Each structure stands twice: as C-alpha cells, then as structure tokens.
C-alpha cells in the first residue's frame, strides 16, 4: 500500500472534523460548523488535489447551510436568490464528484446504476439537471431538504462507515 498525501496532520484531526460537522445532540452554542469549514478551507489551501471529494462536499454543503442563516439587522440587500444559487452548485458538485472522477472514460457505466452501486439513491442523479437546465431555480425549501438529506447521506456512507475497499 503506497502512502497517500492527506492534508490532515493525523487521523485524530479527521475524527475531530467528523465531530465538528455533525454536532452531538446539541447545536445552539456548540454548533462549531463555521470553524470546521474554515479547517477544510486550509485543506484546500495546502492542496485541492490532496483533499478527498467527500470531505470537500461536506464542507461546501455546510458552507451553504451556514450561509442561509442570517437573520440580524440591518436588513441586507440579499433577496434570497444567492442562497438558492449556492445550494445548486453545492449539491451538483457533490453529486458530480461521486459519479465522474476515478475515473471517467470512453466506456462509462450509466449514471443511475453508478448511484445504485456506490449506494447513492437515484434521486440524486437528477439534481445535476434539476438546477442548471430548469428555467427557474428550485424552491429554498426543496434545496434545504436536499442539503440536509445529502449531509446525512455522507455521514452514513463516508464519515461513519468504515468500508475500506474503494
């Protein structure tokens, strides 16, 4: 087994990210997802080619989820479209980095059965063209639902699943 370069200084750092992204039974004052996002921001700084896609997507979806939480005076110019703009790339980049890489080739297994193989439910295949090709952006509620479903999916399949096959 050849060593791979990983941004984190230790596996304990990855456990700490796991705890940070998904708070245990408390999210009021101990939310601590802004700082986990700031950590993955450094992971991007060291090298983006080093960072696994699942960690990148967990950070990016959480970026958008923390983005939509702004309810303080004075009233901001934002008309709630930037949040809807942000979720669409968060989720599309998420679903694309699971299907496309390692490795897209001239012979490619169809996307739906790729999702079935990796365990991704087949409704995630659709949100690639759900946002980019549809005329109007999806409702903020539907995007919120998709993001909170995707984060749970990553927790179930990568963060808290110890399959080492790849």
């Amino acid at each position: 087994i050849p060593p791979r370069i990983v941004p984190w200084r230790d596996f304990a750092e990855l456990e700490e990210l796991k705890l940070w992204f998904y708070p245990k039974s408390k999210g009021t004052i101990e939310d601590k997802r802004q700082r986990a996002v700031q950590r993955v921001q450094s992971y991007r700084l060291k090298g983006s080619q080093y960072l696994p896609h699942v960690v990148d997507s967990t950070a990016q979806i959480t970026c958008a989820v923390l983005l939509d939480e702004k309810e303080a005076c004075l009233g901001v110019h934002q008309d709630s479209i930037p949040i809807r703009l942000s979720y669409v790339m968060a989720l599309i980049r998420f679903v694309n980095g699971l299907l496309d890489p390692t490795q897209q080739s001239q012979f490619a297994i169809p996307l739906h059965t790729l999702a079935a193989k990796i365990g991704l439910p087949s409704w995630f295949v659709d949100l690639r063209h759900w946002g980019t090709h549809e005329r109007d952006l999806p409702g903020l509620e539907m995007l919120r639902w998709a993001a909170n479903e995707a984060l749970s999916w990553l927790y179930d399949h990568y963060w808290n699943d110890e399959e080492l096959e790849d």
Binding site: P3, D10, P52, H53, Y158, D161
Partner: protein, 529 residues
C-alpha cells in the same frame, strides 16, 4: 549500418564520430561536442568547425533532432557534459528515469556516459525539420539583418502545437547570426509568459531574461541550461494564467515596461500560453497592443483555427509605434510531433521533474539528487516587527483562514519568496503570530526564488524552509534591513520530496509522519479529477 569508433576514452567517456558517412548522426542525452573538420548541420543551421565547444541537451521529452554532415570537409567530438548529478534523477523520481536514455535501447548501456546512440531500433522518432515550417522560418531569417531596427517576435500556438520548438529554432538562428556578425551587440531577450510549459523560467513563474550568445547550447534543456540570465521574474504561482488573469496581465505589463527601462534595441522573443479554445482570444488582446509584435505568428491551422480568427484581427493595429508602423501575420502547420505529443512524458509529469530538479540544483551545473530531508533546511525568524518575515500573502480566497489552523496549512507547501522594496509603510495583520497581508496589493515586491516550507515553530517564531542551493547565497546578498514576504499559491510540491522512499532515508520507527497516512482509503474518499 554498423556501429563504429566506440572509444572508451578513460573518464568522461569521450568518443569520436565518422563524418563523411552517409548515415546521419543521432544522439541523445546531455553532452557537448567540438567538431574538428567539416561542417555540421543541426536543424538546417550550419556550424563551422572552428574548434568551438557546443553543449547539447537532448531529452526524450521532445523529439530529438539528428545531426547532419555537410561540406566542407571531413572524413574532441562528443563527450560528457559537466553535469554530475543530473542523470541520476531517476533514483529519486521514478518517472523521469528514462528522460535521457531509452527504456530498452538495443544497445549496451553504460552508466558512465551521459550520451546514448540510437539507430532506428527504439520507439522514438527524430523530427528533423518540416518542410512546411521551413519557408516562413527562412523568410524570418531575412528580416533580421535587413530590418536594421529592433525586431520583436511574438509567437502564439496551443499546447502540443509546437511553439516551443519553433521559438528555439528561431533563438539559435538569431544567436548564430549574432556570433558571426561584427559588431552584433543585440543579444536576445527571451520573454517567457507561459507558466504551463515554461522554458528559461522558474516553476509556475514568468520571466524576462537575457539570452547569452556563448557558450553554445542547443536546444531544449528543461530550464536547466546556463545560456540565459534572468533579468526580471514574477511568481504567477499557477500552472495556468486563468486562475489569476488580471494579476497575470499585470504581471505581464510589468515585464514589457522593463524592456523600455533598459532602452533595449534589437531582437526580442515571446511566447504566450496557447489558449486556442477558451479565454485566450481576450487575453492576447491585452498585450498585442502592448508588446508591439512586429512579427506575429500563428501555428494552429487544423486545430481547428476557428477560434483565433476574430480576436487576432480586432487586436491587430495598423501602427502601434513610430518606427515599426507595421504588423505581420502568417499561418503554418501544427503537426508536431508526428507521434503522440506526450511520448510517455506528460506536461504534468515534466513540470514535476523541473520543480524537483530546482530544489536539488546545487550550483550552475552540479546536482545532488539525494532527498531533501537529508539536506538541512535554513531558518528565518518571522516575528512582530519584523526582521525575518513581514507578512504572508495568500490568494483572494482563504482570507478567513483562522489563526489556529494557519501553521499546518503552510508546512509541506511550495512558496515564493519575495523582497519588499522601498516602503512608504508596512501592511500586516497578525493572526496567531503569523503576519498576513490583509489587503494584498503591494505590487512593489520582487520575486527571488521558490521555497518549500518544512516546519514552523510558533514559540521561537522561526520558519524552517528549503530553498534551492543554487540561489544561495543570493538571499544573503540582500540587505538585512530588507523585508521578506512569503507568498503561497497553488504550486504542487513533488511527492517524492514530501515523503521519500523508505530505502532512501531510514527514520526512527516511533517518529510519526504528520501529513501522510498509510491506511487504505475508505470507500469512498477519492479525489475529484
């Protein structure tokens, strides 16, 4: 068709060649030849036998040109160049092990020879010179002497089209004309604005650098040649300009002006990044009016050329200078090489070799390719004032990089060292004792060398760092009062340097390797590519 004159020649493995033989000479490696009698032809260029030494770099990455014989009249010849450690890079980087010698050569390989003979047996091919490129090239010969004025050539062509080869051909063509013309003091000034496949410049960097007429070097030395002296350089920090376009253009604008600062008159060269399909149609338009290209060239032809038609015409101007008051356009085929452009040597595979060879370049022509971890990195005290480092620069993003996670971000990353010139005032924000440029800007700084951060001690406020030994002691020539800036940009540290093979370096088993892990990657953590 039979090998001849396999002379041992004790040390340096010197050898002689039969000249009048009807078989063209083909040779590969880093060598140097001194021809005794008879004319030689390297890329339809004639070199007399007036007992002058010529260094030759023949990597397998590019198609290797043959050496022809011509009258008159013939029949130390070829011998090892003074590069001791360059050929052993394969011991450190496994991929580049075959850069100078073929894999199976159908020839008795000798470890003591930097040059190797290849005769139609190996997979490689010799490009020679295409007839299609010949005519515009020999016409552009005629526009140097008869011009009687400064002739600046700007050449555009996409990756794998072969702008580098044409520009080389042009460069030796001008250098030969300089040597045999008296008094010709218009030494070439190359202008590498391409960080993707840079020639004559630092990794992921941009450079305006003078080209020395002597000693003779042909043709492509992977930036390891000694025939160029750097006048000015800037750290783009990316494999592609598209990451920082406005910065890149600014980095370009500062180079061109330098040429007027020297009041330089004579031939100058330039290669932009290809960008055949994409943003490029706009980027060239910024400096086509700025560079004043007297001889603009196009290369793509059946790329197709559908993209570089409307923008080049809008960019072209009738007269951008009082003296020139003209512009030229020409199109030539792009098929180079005939075989696959990679030839088992991808651009990303060769950029890594260039970065690796930089950090192991001891002197002008001596390389020590032992892993960096054996070498002792040197230290600078970044502080509050400070005297060691005044600020660390990051791209526009990553600005909320919080103070307690900066340190582990820096270690193991290739950086660009900068000196801060005459300062009206300092601009620094301290985060966990790390000085960081909050507003960026600071265009007055000048780039010195690349560096690889090894470790950071927050207590002693020191910064262990590797710099190429070639630059040392250029860092010491700088005044002590001069401020230092550490710029981080997306430059890829070589993998072998970051963690060497266990056979190369033996560590204590209890010592933990921080930024690397040995466990099998969990399903499914894969890097998006």
């Amino acid at each position: 068709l039979i090998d001849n004159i396999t002379y041992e020649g004790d040390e340096d493995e010197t050898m002689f060649v039969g000249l009048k033989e009807k078989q063209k000479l083909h040779l590969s490696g880093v060598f140097r030849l001194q021809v005794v009698k008879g004319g030689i032809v390297y890329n339809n260029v004639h070199y007399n036998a007036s007992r002058e030494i010529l260094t030759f770099w023949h990597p397998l990455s590019q198609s290797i040109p043959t050496i022809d014989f011509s009258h008159f009249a013939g029949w130390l010849r070829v011998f090892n160049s003074n590069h001791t450690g360059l050929l052993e890079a394969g011991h450190l980087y496994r991929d580049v092990n075959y850069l100078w010698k073929p894999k199976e050569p159908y020839f008795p390989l000798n470890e003591r020879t930097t040059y190797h003979l290849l005769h139609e047996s190996d997979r490689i091919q010799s490009l020679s010179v295409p007839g299609y490129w010949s005519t515009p090239l020999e016409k552009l010969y005629l526009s140097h002497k008869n011009a009687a004025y400064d002739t600046r050539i700007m050449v555009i062509g996409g990756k794998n089209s072969g702008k580098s080869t044409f520009l080389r051909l042009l460069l030796e063509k001008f250098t030969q004309d300089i040597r045999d013309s008296t008094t010709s003091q218009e030494e070439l000034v190359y202008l590498d604005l391409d960080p993707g496949q840079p020639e004559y410049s630092l990794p992921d960097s941009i450079s305006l650098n003078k080209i020395l007429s002597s000693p003779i070097s042909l043709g492509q030395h992977l930036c390891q040649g000694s025939n160029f002296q750097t006048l000015l350089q800037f750290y783009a920090g990316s494999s592609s300009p598209q990451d920082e376009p406005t910065s890149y253009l600014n980095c370009a604008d500062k180079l061109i002006d330098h040429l007027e600062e020297q009041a330089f008159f004579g031939t100058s060269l330039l290669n932009l990044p290809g960008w055949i399909k994409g943003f490029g149609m706009q980027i060239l338009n910024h400096i086509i009016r700025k560079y004043k290209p007297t001889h603009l060239l196009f290369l793509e032809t059946a790329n197709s050329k559908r993209h570089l038609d409307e923008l080049t015409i809008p960019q072209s101007f009738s007269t951008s200078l009082r003296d020139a008051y003209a512009p030229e356009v020409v199109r030539v085929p792009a098929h180079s090489l005939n075989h696959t452009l990679s030839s088992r040597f991808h651009a990303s595979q060769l950029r890594t070799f260039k970065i690796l060879a930089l950090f192991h370049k001891i002197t002008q022509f001596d390389y020590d390719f032992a892993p960096l971890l054996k070498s002792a990195p040197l230290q600078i005290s970044y502080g509050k004032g400070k005297s060691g480092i005044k600020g660390i620069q990051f791209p526009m993003e990553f600005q909320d990089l919080n103070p307690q996670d900066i340190k582990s971000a820096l270690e193991g990353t290739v950086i660009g060292i900068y000196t801060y010139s005459g300062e009206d005032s300092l601009e620094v924000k301290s985060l966990n004792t790390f000085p960081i440029l909050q507003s960026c800007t600071s265009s007055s700084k000048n780039f010195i060398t690349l560096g690889l951060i090894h470790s950071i001690d927050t207590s002693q406020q020191i910064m262990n760092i590797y710099v190429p030994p070639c630059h040392t002691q250029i860092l010491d020539k700088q005044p002590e009062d001069a401020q230092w800036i550490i710029v981080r940009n997306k430059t890829e540290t070589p993998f072998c340097d970051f963690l060497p093979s266990p056979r190369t370096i033996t560590w204590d088993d209890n010592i933990q390797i921080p930024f690397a892990t040995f466990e099998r990657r969990k399903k499914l953590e894969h890097v998006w590519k």
